[PDB]
Symmetry: C3
Subunit: 422 residues, 3 copies
């Protein structure tokens, strides 16, 4: 039934490629926490999955936060007297500080310098900067290109707008047999950078695309929203729905060649933590698990004391990686096998969530005479521990065995009627 997910896991190599192509299509667009770039991004996503798109008015109070003004940008450049655009937004949108106020000026190098940003230690990288909440403006460039700049009169143009508007977020909901809900979120505010965070956006899109085709026990909600402000906005508009969210994962940085990393929920041993660590344990690659900390991505909002949901984060090279928030986080930094593997892992997690049943041994008094009914070690564990209190995940953990081994053992026993679902 959910065994239908197996073909998706088996074709993950090909899907890693499709996930990459979506990243490549999204790459050039200038996202921020608001704006037409976010809207162009939602359009592209809706070529793959349905979404309901929400627009929350600037000035709307979302718990302690206020929905900001909307920002947009047509062009930006620093041009020299010889006419050459020595900095050009059209070449890389990381060249402009996100939320830059509009500017049109002539300035000398010395007057421009304070608004220029480089990375001296990596003379070839463009730094990514933002200024969402204090009015400001900036240009980023490589140190190497900075070092070649002259004393001169430069035309400085940032053709932007910062006006009351609205904040875009997208949402897709799959109704399962049950209202209990698994939440998968990712953030849409980063512009032309790949691991952080076109990888999460493209991954969650394809997970949604696969789940759409299956009959699930749980309901699944997929949130695409700007980081921090988006999740706060969503929570402020959905307090009624929180009681059903059983578990969740924030997807980001899921595309590079490195090993998988799992950040636990604030509780450390919630069902989702136990499920994800059990999948990693038996997956055959290296991985690393970290405890919760109240910074990083939107798991901070979901794990606030007043929200208090079980949300972790399954990543590859976690944010902080070398080149993050710079132009080094580009298309060639994406790895197809990495994307394939992250997608496969998420699907295995979902398969585990769905098939984590609890059973009662219908012949608890000594073992049954296996043979009256037509992997024996797994079976003996399932019979032995199915007192009504142990889940298959519990048995997989105590036995040290892989989850599917336990599951298939339980299937076989259920067929010969030695188990009742409870």
């Amino acid at each position: 039934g959910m065994e239908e997910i197996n073909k998706y896991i088996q074709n993950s190599s090909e899907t890693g490629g499709e996930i990459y192509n979506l990243i490549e299509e999204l790459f050039p667009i200038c996202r921020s926490i608001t704006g037409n770039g976010v809207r162009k991004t939602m359009d592209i996503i809706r070529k793959h999955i349905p979404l309901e798109i929400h627009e929350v008015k600037s000035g709307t109070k979302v718990f302690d936060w206020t929905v900001p003004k909307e920002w947009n940008i047509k062009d930006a450049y620093v041009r020299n007297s010889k006419g050459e655009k020595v900095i050009d937004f059209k070449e890389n949108n990381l060249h402009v500080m996100s939320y830059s106020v509009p500017v049109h000026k002539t300035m000398t190098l010395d007057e421009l310098k304070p608004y220029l940003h480089t990375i001296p230690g990596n003379k070839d990288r463009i730094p990514y900067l933002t200024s969402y909440y204090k009015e400001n403006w900036g240009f980023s460039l490589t140190q190497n290109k900075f070092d070649e700049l002259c004393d001169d009169d430069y035309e400085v143009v940032i053709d932007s707008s910062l006006e009351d508007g609205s904040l875009t977020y997208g949402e897709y909901y799959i109704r399962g047999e049950l209202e209990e809900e698994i939440l998968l979120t990712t953030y849409t505010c980063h512009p032309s950078m790949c691991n952080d965070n076109l990888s999460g956006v493209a991954l969650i899109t394809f997970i949604a695309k696969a789940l759409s085709k299956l009959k699930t026990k749980y309901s699944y909600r997929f949130l695409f929203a700007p980081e921090t402000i988006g999740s706060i906005t969503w929570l402020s508009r959905n307090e009624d729905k929180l009681k059903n969210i059983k578990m969740g994962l924030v997807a980001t940085c899921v595309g590079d060649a490195g090993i998988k990393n799992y950040k636990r929920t604030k509780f450390g041993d919630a069902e989702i933590d136990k499920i994800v660590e059990k999948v990693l344990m038996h997956c055959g690659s290296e991985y690393y698990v970290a405890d919760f900390f109240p910074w990083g991505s939107d798991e901070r909002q979901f794990s606030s004391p007043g929200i208090n949901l079980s949300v972790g984060s399954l990543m590859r090279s976690c944010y902080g990686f070398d080149g993050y928030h710079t132009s080094a986080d580009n298309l060639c930094y994406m790895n197809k096998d990495g994307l394939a593997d992250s997608y496969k892992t998420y699907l295995e997690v979902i398969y585990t969530i769905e098939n984590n049943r609890t059973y009662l041994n219908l012949n608890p008094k000594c073992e049954p005479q296996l043979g009256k009914r037509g992997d024996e070690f797994a079976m003996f564990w399932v019979l032995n521990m199915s007192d009504g209190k142990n889940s298959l995940l519990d048995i997989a953990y105590k036995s040290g065995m892989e989850f599917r081994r336990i599951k298939y053992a339980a299937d076989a026993l259920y067929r010969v009627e030695l188990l009742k679902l409870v």
Copy 2:
């Protein structure tokens, strides 16, 4: 009082020898899960301890199981045209597959070969095979002897019977001051092999023989029954008695030169687990402790969810050892010091079970002025932790001290009336 066990522990070397002699006497007899071999074995045991012998009719439903037909064997052989018994049951009863249907045939080597069994990797071993529940027949032989066999017409004789009869089990019960019961079980179905399982049979016999002579707090029951089918049969006939079984041990593989191994109860930290690991910890030899798993010996039946007793297994080289289920598990594989040591350890376990009291310090407000009443570190622990909630085993564990040190410290304090038994 139970201090009377000390002389038995001190004479364990001599007893290891007596335990060996019982093994040697039992060795030649052809046991199976039923049959006259089991009966001859119960006769020999009753030369040492009393037993009540039970016979359960073939076809009796014992929980999900059915008591099998009774199997017996007079002779078996493969004879060549020259008249030579190239396989001879009288030389080793491992040469016949247990429960072999009777056969009387002439066959060529090629027709015989499929019913012949060897161990290619150990060209000198006879494999032990059984076929309790599907009708069948087989001969085991060494690969080396197989390799010397000719194309020929062979007379093939297995003079056996497989008929409705009854299943034998033996039982000995010692009444203590209390009905709470310690259960010690071993299995009687293996033929001419020593570690698995004449060692458990001879050991438990001698433990019973020693306990018989002592005034015990607990009641003790000793079960001698075929593996699996015997324990299921016993449980099916004694549901009324299960509420009193406080703890138990299955004895097998207790006779070789290797280190001691303890398999825990399914609960992992039951009183018996804590007691056995505390004895091993301070015993002065190497040992290994394993967690429960629902296969191996009869602890699977006792640990079924519907029975759910605390039964572990104290062994030497656990089943799976090199040569197990083969003719290599012979008399020379038994080691007297091993048998002596296993017996000593079981007695120390029993001494601990019996003397694990709980006391109340009658002078809890500061330490007493020791000197008003005529190993001080042990004493201070006993006084300090005897609030009515801590057992001597608890104190031995927290103090890191050996159990007898704590016990004797508690004795001395009880004498000067600084402790109340509670």
Copy 3:
């Protein structure tokens, strides 16, 4: 507020010197469990802090103990025929066994020898011996000096008295906002030895001296009493006060050049254990933590089952150190930086005890938009874990961060009204 303790911690080097000078002043006085030496010691202490001095009559029943006779000593010596005091109390009070009955005799070397005590393994040390509860007398001397002694007639004089009198103990109480009480005890019965225990006496004096000048939340009691008999006497006279003692520390051996050692309370994870281990963890030096054992110093009386308070012991080189109970434990064995460091650590412990508050995040629904109100990682932890159930110590532990970092983060949040004290 308690931030006023910071200047005392910052001036600890100078205070280590003052603590040393008190030790030096106290060093020559002949303390025992009773006597005028204890009284001279209380006089000197009262030059630094107020004390209430108690005198409990010999023969008074203090729980199971009896207050002993009072012992005093004017002079003691062994003199040879040539007139030379070959042993002289005036040179070192360790030369006389504490509680020595008075003696005035002429004896030959062979008759004297059984009452002489040396340390053969450290031919230059005077052993410290006592005989509080059986009547007796002895002289201690170096092996080297013993080896130079002649066959001779020696005048043997111990000018002492052992008569019904009273047992002295001193006590100082600081009333805090709350009656809940922190108890700091030290023992006054050791004569001319420094680490054991003029160091505890001088340290606790200076802690009392500093706390006296601060407005504390908790009440603080400082007990100066002979070991064992003194604490039992105090407990027997203050059962009514025990319900308020939240935590406590016994100070001894706090003056040498070695690393800090913490002995835990019998509970192992009481608030005081958690506080002291958290201070050590981040203090920047090596340390060692030990579990409770019911011997050593007065934590045995406080941790009796009938008293059952949370009292640990924060030391440097714990009793048992090389030279302990000998003349090697002298002034040069005291280290100023050691004394300074022990005092600083005790003050940091007290600062932690006082500032370990519990708060409620007043904006629990998602993080606040920090910026509406004017070390961010610490702050995010405090906001995230302040659900009303977590103390700052809890947050410091879970975050792995140093306690003051958490405290100051909590201060800042409290100021902008994002936290309620609960």
